[PDB]
Amino acid sequence: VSPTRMNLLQRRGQLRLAQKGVDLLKKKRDALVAEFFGLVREAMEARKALDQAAKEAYAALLLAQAFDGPEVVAGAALGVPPLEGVEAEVENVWGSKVPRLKATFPDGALLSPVGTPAYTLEASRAFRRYAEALIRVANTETRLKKIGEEIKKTTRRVNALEQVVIPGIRAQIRFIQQVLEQREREDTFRLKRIKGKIEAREAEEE
Amino acid sequence: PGGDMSEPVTQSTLRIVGAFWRLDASLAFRRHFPAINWNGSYSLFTSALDPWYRENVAEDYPELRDAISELLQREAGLQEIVQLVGPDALQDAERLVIEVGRIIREDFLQQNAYHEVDAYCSMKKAYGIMKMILAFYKEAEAAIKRGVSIDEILQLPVLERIGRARYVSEEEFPAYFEEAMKEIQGAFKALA
Amino acid sequence: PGGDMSEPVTQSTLRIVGAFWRLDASLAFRRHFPAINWNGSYSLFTSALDPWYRENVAEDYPELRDAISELLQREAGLQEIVQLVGPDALQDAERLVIEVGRIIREDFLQQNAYHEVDAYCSMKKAYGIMKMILAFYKEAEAAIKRGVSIDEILQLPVLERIGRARYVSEEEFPAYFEEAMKEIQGAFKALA
Amino acid sequence: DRTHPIPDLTGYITEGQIQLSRELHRKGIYPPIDPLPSLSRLMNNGVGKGKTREDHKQVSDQLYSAYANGVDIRKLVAIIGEDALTENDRRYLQFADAFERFFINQGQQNRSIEESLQIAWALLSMLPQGELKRISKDHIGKYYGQKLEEIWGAP
Amino acid sequence: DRTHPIPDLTGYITEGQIQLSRELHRKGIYPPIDPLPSLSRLMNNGVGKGKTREDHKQVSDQLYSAYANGVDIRKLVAIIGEDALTENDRRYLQFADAFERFFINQGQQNRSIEESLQIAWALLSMLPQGELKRISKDHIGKYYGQKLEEIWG
Amino acid sequence: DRTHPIPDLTGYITEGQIQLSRELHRKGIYPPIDPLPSLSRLMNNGVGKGKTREDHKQVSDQLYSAYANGVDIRKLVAIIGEDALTENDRRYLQFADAFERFFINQGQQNRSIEESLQIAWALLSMLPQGELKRISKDHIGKYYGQKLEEI
Amino acid sequence: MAVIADPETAQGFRLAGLEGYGASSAEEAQSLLETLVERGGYALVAVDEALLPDPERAVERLMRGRDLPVLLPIAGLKEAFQGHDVEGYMRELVRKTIGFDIKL
Questions:
Q1: Where are the domains of chain G?
Q2: Which of B114, D135, E132, F56 makes the best surface tag, with the fewest CB within 10 Å?
Q3: Are C148 and C188 in contact (CB under 8 A)?
Q4: Hey, what's the signal peptide range on this chain (chain F)?
């Protein structure tokens, strides 16, 4: 790169901007981690709630197939169609979009809701709640993954800067400064030569 | 020599002149003329010329000029982050600052000397263009505050009029400018 | 000129001197007086002075000094984790290390030159305070092995006894240190 | 360039410096003095009780720290957004804006030390009590709370 | 080094310069002429209506604008990665690459000014109509639209 | 600065270079010699049969390869993380660490050439017999397998 | 939504309205997961840890270009009654995403 004083000043300005950018990235990462360590709390609360919901739903379903014939329960289940009620919208999180399952959940869309077995119909509500819990746990988990990747990316940027960019600009600055000092030394040597020339002229031939 | 501004001649001139029109290699390379480096240029006659501007151009010309200076300085501040992380990483208001900065660069500071119209610009024409830009910025900022998507502001047709105002003839300019102000009010009034 | 250590004067000096004491205004901003940065300071006199220590102050003074140095180094090597995550989030061992680093910094390195007594300290006072801190560290490590929560250690009454060793008189110190060692051995026995 | 001979040698011989900032000048602020790189090396000996008011050193320290925090938040909000910031950070943002607008930008007015300290306390009132970590409790009690309307009426 | 005394004084004396590029040379482009540092002072005196063609000057200006945008976007990718690029940015990158490969790179071939203008136009057609702010509307109507395939392949 | 006139002109005159590293010093390693940027230009003609023993050059080249590979993997861990490393990468990182801890860190020991070669062979034995691409099969058979039992 | 698990719970999931298939070994489970993933459809797949603790680490080679499907390790049927360390799940998850494995 061209060794000149203006180039040196521009390189130093770049170095200052790089240090400022490292501070800015660190602060962004601090915000990200502050959010991540609370979103983990939310995720664990959701996970324990889902565990409880699944336990209760399984307990409710267990006795349904005992008192009543399993074949009749299977037929009643086949009567219910596999309808769709999940709306996979996009939620903006830290500048990123993630799939949010804001399910409309139409309860009246279940064809042939009535089940011949006495207890099978009641068990449907338990599995609906279990599915809601599963959707919730998935929703929190995806965003947790996203924030993790964001923190990893930010730390990649910070390390790249502080380990590749700043030292490189330091080396460039040192090189340019050395070249300028050399030019100054050559100029001083020349000035000494010419001053000695004039002094010798005066001393010898006046 | 070399474009270096630390030469004794340039430094000696800096300490005596009242205005410094610093030219830039980056802009001239892009064929962006006059190619003046805004950050490294200055004037010292601005304060003393306010009365004349109020009398002979517009009673609020000083404030419009200062508003453009404010916007350009905001752009210059945000460009650090732009280089760090890129334009998409910024918020919408900062993106608007960047975009209005580009509008000022291309539609107000840019000027063509080989054109039969834009080679010369009167003070009132500059004032009209500046007023158009400031009005647009206020409208767009309000829209962002009311939630309009920034990508949708950049497609407003009024931007082509703001950008082509340079090439309007001096005699025709006042009508074009009145129409442009009307259209700027409309382009956001309709959205409501 | 601006703290840069790359200049010829500082480089020539450091080539010929034995001890470099790095005063830092950062420590002063943190009210850590005297403000010496133990990471960049260095002394080339310790090995030759060890025999004097074994003969005059104590046969184990070198060991306690080196242990304190290593403990400070470990406190320094945990900085990245405490930077990414808060202090409470660290596990028991790391949190013990950070708290012991704090107590070391505040009660052994710190000295108040405007105090009637703390302005001066003998090598036996330093050996005593260092032995107190290291004995506390070993007992606390054992206790955390036993499973006691770090909060209990954080509130142990021995903290006040070890923190005031600076402000005690030269003649009174020996009995105080004996009592402090007895009470350090005791205070962990009562705790489960 | 602060590394130049003239300012470097002047820094060796003199005691501090009052630094003018181009960003403030272009933003329209006069006098454009940036407190952050400014330093008065003798300020301590000329400040305090019996010369000025008792709350001068601590008010200067709090102003410095708060302004630094505010500029930091201003840089970060361009990428994370105003909502992402906590409430104390937003307080710092507003404080920095008000500091630039009312403290630094005094035009041609002649401010006595009492008027300046009044403005300083008005600016500091925006931050909550308890975030004034660098001012003694008694000083905060005596001088905290004054609203910005005292000087905002006639800036 | 363009800052060296010899090129510096020559450029202060002469009426432009054609500056070669080692980066384009390594990629195999001949003549390896980088247009951004190049310049011709007297150009405006020999181009236009009655001399070469009416669209010449505006075409050259637009080519400079687009190539500069492409170089900037390359620098942006060097720090952020292609995945973050918007559609317009990718169009500008593709324009820069096609420019280097089909306008700058010609080998040993005599291109009439008409062929060169045709190639420039086919390349500028890679960009949306509205981005051509330096070319007059009538010229855009008269020359925009032709694709690069009509010339080769 | 290796580009300073003093080291630069000395390197132009001398027949190699032994280089000390600050990383090894901050790690508390004595002597802190970094093998990778060091070199002995005349080494090839002063090791082998009748001069040390026949495994010297191959062992030296293999140690160089293993340690350089380990350092490359170590800098490769600043991207993908430990969890992403394969078995070979784990073996190479472990070898690099143990190399630093035993072959370089010798305090004030007066290691003999035979002792140093034994330590080297023990450290190499951590890596599989098939990855020692630079050592003739005979030497691997003769000296491979000894563990780091001597401490 | 689709779930792969033992045959006994597959019928229950079908009763819930989801898609269930019997799974009893790692190889067949992985093959069925590949078939489901390559089959464009629902965005979530629940996999038992007993048969495939890390389905993503096993079938990452496909969904990189299409990350629409979601893999969530669901607790196993046998482990459900006797329970499992939920705290361990998030602990190990942090270990994976940050690498410091620090918490309390």
A1: 1-100
A2: B114
A3: no
A4: none
